[PDB]
């Protein structure tokens, strides 16, 4: 299985932007337990959401996860300047975890 994300997306401060996660095997299901992880400059990683829509404690409420159509999605509602970073999704396939290529989010 191969996981695909948008290479790069551009948004503006305060706007709503949606990042997606694609599974090459078919539609993303709740059994894929989609995760979303954020990478900030200087190799600073933070987990945001797991199990599709479960936010880790302490993560800003503006980050939400869901399944939209055949993919898993990360919605950033009211993008902040500090949200500019690389976002990785990872899907579970019944024994192993596979990361997407990551999405570079630019916030104008």
């Amino acid at each position: 299985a191969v996981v695909t994300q948008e290479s790069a997306l551009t948004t503006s401060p305060g706007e709503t932007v949606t990042l997606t996660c694609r599974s090459s095997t078919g539609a993303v299901t709740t059994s894929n337990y989609a995760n979303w992880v954020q990478e900030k400059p200087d190799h600073l990683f933070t987990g945001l959401i797991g199990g599709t829509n479960n936010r880790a404690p302490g993560v800003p409420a503006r980050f939400s996860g869901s399944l939209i159509g055949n993919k898993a999605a990360l919605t950033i509602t009211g993008a902040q300047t500090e949200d500019e970073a690389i976002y990785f999704c990872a899907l579970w396939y019944s024994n192993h975890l596979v990361f997407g290529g990551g999405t570079k989010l630019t916030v104008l």
């Binding site: 992880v37 990683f45 933070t46 987990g47 936010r55 880790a56 990872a90 192993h96 975890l97 997407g100």
Partner: protein
């Protein structure tokens, strides 16, 4: 208060082995799994596997079956990953990242990463 502190940079010869550490603190070590992830430029992130510090049960990426060995030491709240038969393909930054799995799943805290360079002794 939660911290995942990984060992310092490593420089090793091709064909050798190396053991990386991830010292956990600020929480119940045995309550969260610990994943290991590999980062190489232009290659995003690559899952190595995870270990359940409660019993030391592991689940690996089949690609890393014969490469990585995950262990933990409960008393020192430290998770380890050994990488063997090193080649230039193993040169990367490695991270440990904890995961909650009781009722739901999610990553949260990640280590700062440890850089490994597989280099021939001139």
């Amino acid at each position: 208060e939660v911290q995942l502190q990984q060992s310092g940079a490593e420089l090793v010869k091709p064909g050798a082995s190396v053991k990386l550490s991830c010292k956990a603190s600020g929480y119940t070590f045995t309550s969260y799994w610990m994943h290991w992830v590999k980062q190489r430029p232009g290659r995003g992130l690559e899952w190595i596997g995870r270990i359940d510090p409660n019993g030391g049960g592991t689940k690996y990426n089949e690609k890393f079956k014969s490469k990585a060995t995950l262990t933990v030491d409960k008393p020192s709240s430290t998770a380890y990953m050994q990488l063997s038969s090193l080649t230039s393909e193993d040169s990367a930054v490695y991270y440990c990242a904890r995961m909650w799995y009781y009722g739901t799943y999610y990553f949260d805290y990640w280590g700062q990463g440890t850089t490994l360079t597989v280099s021939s002794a001139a």
